[PDB]
């Protein structure tokens, strides 16, 4: 009817921990269509302020493309109506060891300059009552990634969302990414990459479990 | 006469632990030949529903090829009459350290979409009374891989099968694989890979042994 | 109203050259919904013939998942209603040298066994009157790849589709892919890869141009 | 009834060119079973001459294992009754550019010492009236590889067999391999590898075509 | 006069531990010359049973070449008359840390099928009263490698031989090898490799020393 | 008005620990302009002593270029008026795990010969009350790098500056670099590189945390 | 007595072509000792202008160290008294093919900023009447490298020096280097590298010879 | 009786071309035993001149070891009595394309300083009437390598020896090597390597053949 | 006046521990010039015994070159008059963590055959009262490397020399090298490398420190 049981749960969990993305309730019920047009409008003004000849065929549709990109694509994660459908199967296999999904493609945006964050996430968890569909993990990562982020927050959000859905605190998330906020401009460091990890349950308590995960983290190319 | 002592033991072990692949007893004794033909028929219908011109020389034999592939090849692991012949030699060498067989080629099928799972397995065990033929390890892995799987279950099954045959709980199995269920369709993540491990005996108890194995797991290319 | 001007053109071009995928006209106007359900039914029967216990939570939804994957995903390319929207900008830059888009991710299906084909395509063309949006090239490749293919045909189709849309014969397509039809079963060759190329215009005529393209073809990892 | 049309053709072609493996007609019609037993007997004698304690469980079955390996496995190519089934589809795609199958796994035996030859073959051909199933190429390479060989002969044999089956002289075969005949014993050169190529049709005549193929030959790891 | 003090010691040590290669005392004092000729004879028969035309110049000398290879080369390790001369210098340097010799080239034969085993050994030891010439370590490895082996036994044998000669139990041997018994035939796994280790003294007792060695084990290419 | 609160704090902290770069108070208030001209003058004399023909168009502006490089570029870190603007956000994410910024491009000058030091730094810290902007870390590293350094001091300085700004002693800095002071002249060692680390807080106290950081240190290329 | 016949020849050759480093005749005969002291003085002033506390033990000797480095090391190539001794042997081997010395370590200084240039040179020549000692080539490269350079000139100088000494115009020189002038400061491009080549004789005339050389140029790491 | 027909032929061919190693006829028929002892004596004197305490157990046997190494090992190539036995088989395969043996391990000695030369040779030839045993090529290379060499001569010698034995001028030899004469001392260039090639027949005449060979030359690691 | 304070200290330290290279006091005060000439003479005789035509221009100067190489270059470490000048700066930085200088180029000679040893050393130490110039470490390594060595001794010598000069026992030295004594001759193992380590102070006592060092030891290429 609006948000799925999962979307609701995850959202509440995040709000409770104070880990939700800084959002303000919708001032007025606007259709995404009207928001897009308004954003497109402001973009048109910014491009004109930059002295771009909006009459050019190639630049003409840009304000609209950017508006759609924001509302529908790169910032779609802000709307829980886009939360993926979660499928869980009973842990009949009686798995008691961690399942690790590595090198998940992740593309996000640094909220301080609205510039690309390109990286990879490694998620691992120890199955309790249910096992989650591998694809679902990738989708959850993408969801939170599609928001104006701060890697420190992004990692935390993914962790909690998964803990909530899997019903286990034994979840670990590690994200290694390149920030164009740092590379493409400013200090323009062409080689640095940032790594942030958030560990829950045994992954934080048990040094044994913690290190097994950390050792598995990151690969090459 | 039907199933070898080994095939029987392994099958029982799996059923006991409740780790056997979800199978229903044969409704009627059909020849694999009749099953193949029946499967071929259903495929013919599916292809027709997809509007494929089955009159084309290249597509003509597909329903049969698929049927044979299923029954004889990719799902042959479901029939214990195909279980490999196990050869064990007396551990006169008095080996007390683990023997590791790494990078075993593994090709399986994700049962949720019947799509390719391509990866590699690393198996290790500490010889007790007998040492197994290296090739047999690769064969057992392939056997269980030739079934509609769920990586979490596949890893478990191989572990138990080996424990049963070697007569030692000191066995460890780690499988790293790419699921086309995730890559080729759905979220289409082109870089993620899943790693699952199942540890028995000392490999689970002894942190020392456990880490020695984990440290050896995985290589490159 | 049905097919876009582009979809129609490409389809006609393919039929004219006799390079279209072997298709029979829809016997009856069935909703994709009814086709999916029918396919799901045939799958149910096949799985039962394989003796799989469809009562298992994990296997239960498979017949439906496969049906949807076929109609909506992996074989969606058979329906021109799914042809991407093509955007072309005027070649005001007066580009006379080839534009190469390399390492396009490609996932298709070998029609002889309905098994995964995983590879990468390198497409190049010399802009005439218009320049195409880079993303569109990737999209066209994916479209044709989402069909029961034979690499030799796939390469040809992409070539013609591009030539038609760009209005230039100067297009070159090279595809390097691994066939699980070969790796996962049958001879089980774990290392072979197939490369097929289709050259048009100067890429075939001019040895100079031809080699410049070929030299650029393929990379590593 | 005995040999397939294909097996016969290929065999004749090889005999005609005087490129067949040095074989003598079967002195007497012996069952492979009796041959294996005889070979096993000779091996038993050789092992005893080496002073190996054949009473040892590990060595006990070796004479039989070696006999079966020779007759059924590594030298099976000597019997045309094992020639693969060739599937050819009409070249409706009108492919006029070469199709290259690279990195075909190849394991053979150096006939001068009966020691392992491990390598990879690259085969390419320009489709005339028919296109061959990719897997079939790998199979044909394996067939001729499963014989006491001399790389110079092996490459020639594969070339001819393919030209004959495809009905085109435009075929090229290149094999790069490590001979344990050289590495494991004798001079014990741990790094050398031998590369041999055989070119037919345009691949030999047309310098353009020749170099395109040669440039594609060999990869890494 | 026959066997050196070293050869005798090592042989006795191996027989005591029951780690010697399964050998039967020479039934009759035969010259290696007569043994070679007899082996050559049996080989002639085997090749004839395989229907090879022994009249061919290339195949003609094979029976003799194989016989010499067996007796003089690949199985020479069976004769302690071929044991290397060991040179030991007084540990005046007062070395108390381990000396590691890595990537020792090792070529052996899997006794179950008489096929090539190609790998590399890493040997380490903590000097007590004497230091051994580095080359000697490679020679001892080669000696035991030149025998019909089972990697599990090979590793053990090298360990004991070294312990005996160095007069220290603090020796560690690790061998990583590819078995063509597995790759070239049978299951034909093109990627798996086996690793076996045998640890003596501190390398087994001291977890600290043990891991330092294990961490050093294996390199790339 | 002169130095920012941050610049002042950091400077004081360094002086307090006695880790500041050996500086003498400005003998007289000179404009950077006059300093540059004076430096350029001395360089002119040096070049003349080296017998370089300063009348050459290429060498003519060198004295000035060097002077500007020293004052404005490579030694600009000596003037705290160039200290970066630090942005800190409240640690609302409640991050308790370390944030690692790896492969920070670092170019400094070995004060003993005024020759290039080219390397990379890895910085990590455990957020207390505030999280710092990733780029800022790179900037601080660059700041101190832009001074006549001694890697041992450089590492210490970056550590302290960070501890001061973040208000946490839990900071770790590791720098790996190539000194042309060693490579380009003198002993001319073309392969050596120096690695220095400075650990604060838990990174020094907790062996667990210390090793997690060290394990993450350094990558390739 | 002063300059060797070789030094004289090379110097004259360069002067004639107008390729010599911009030098002014020594204004007065000063001992390198007095020049070093004078330079050291200028450096002391420059360091003081930078506000460096020369009282510090580490910085104290810097002015002298830099002065010695300039006169004796990095700029020693400016004095032909340092020209290496050239050894040539009669080309009795009758070599008519090119001899290539690749990956020659080269460290020079960009004269526009007096900053490090780190790279590698590849030199090749076709022996005429004499063959030069390989080491001598490396030495000649170093000689000219030890000067305030401009890569374009450096390459030309080495070419001519070699042509003169070898008595053959058939010489080719290629230098690939990284300029810290670009990396460490200014635009700070961390990845670019400059390649310059100078070709003499057949290496310029004969396209065949030219490309053979160029194809050989550059390697990795 | 002394020298084989092959050794004789090769020696004559070399002397004819004036490519033989500078040798003087044996002044007196001395046993290698007496020569070794004499050399050992001179070495004893040299070591004593270096002030080495020959009473030390480790240095004691050095003069003898060196003497034996010279006469029996590293310089054994000077004695044609050590020339390998050449085995040639009739080119019944009718090979008309070149056979390439790459990465042949080569270790020689730079005659100017008697220091190690470590490299790899790539040999190729077009079979005329006979095909040579692959191992023989490696052996011939080693033979000439075991002499005080100059890479330019070494390459020439191998070329001629092969041309003579194969009865074809179509032979090509390329040697890439590192000279410790350059690396370990003198200029101490840690990265340079020398490549020398000698081409015969078509490999020199036919630009097509020539480049095919050259393009194949050299690999990595 | 003869030996520096440092040279004397280091020499005494080594002699005290009995780790000095086996040397006999100079029998008579000979000029290095006369020693070189005497050595040259003995070499002349050795070359003549090898039947080398010393009249050849290329071989003519060899006896002298070798004599100079021995006395002035490769064995110059035997004379403490060649010990490097050590520069130490006060540890004002208050460095308490280890400084590691890795991949130090090392070229020595195996005293048992006087053949090249090519390797790399990794030296680390924890600064006490003074910090040493990085280059000095490389120089000290080279000094001891320039002597007839046994890797086991070489490592020990470097360790002690450093401990003595730095006034700290907290020094660790690890050397990984390839011995041509093993590769170029004798067993001719083309892949083995030896690794030796000597640990002082905390590097031996503290398992924590010990492992931090060991983990950092060795890199690739």
Curated annotation (Swiss-Prot), chains A, B, C, D, E, F, G, H, I:
Keywords: Allosteric enzyme, GTP-binding, Hydrolase, Metal-binding, Nucleotide-binding, One-carbon metabolism, Zinc. SUPFAM superfamilies: Tetrahydrobiopterin biosynthesis enzymes-like. Pathway: Cofactor biosynthesis; 7,8-dihydroneopterin triphosphate biosynthesis; 7,8-dihydroneopterin triphosphate from GTP: step 1/1. InterPro entries: GTP-CH-I_C/QueF, GTP-CH-I_N, GTP_CycHdrlase_I, GTP_CycHdrlase_I_CS, GTP_CycHdrlase_I_dom. Coiled coil: none annotated. GO terms for molecular function: GTP binding; GTP cyclohydrolase I activity; identical protein binding; zinc ion binding. It catalyses: GTP + H2O = 7,8-dihydroneopterin 3'-triphosphate + formate + H(+). Allosteric enzyme. Activity is modulated by K(+), divalent cations, UTP, and tetrahydrobiopterin. Tetrahydrobiopterin is an inhibitor of this enzyme. PROSITE patterns: GTP_CYCLOHYDROL_1_1, GTP_CYCLOHYDROL_1_2. Toroid-shaped homodecamer, composed of two pentamers of five dimers. This is GTP cyclohydrolase 1. It comes from Escherichia coli (strain K12).
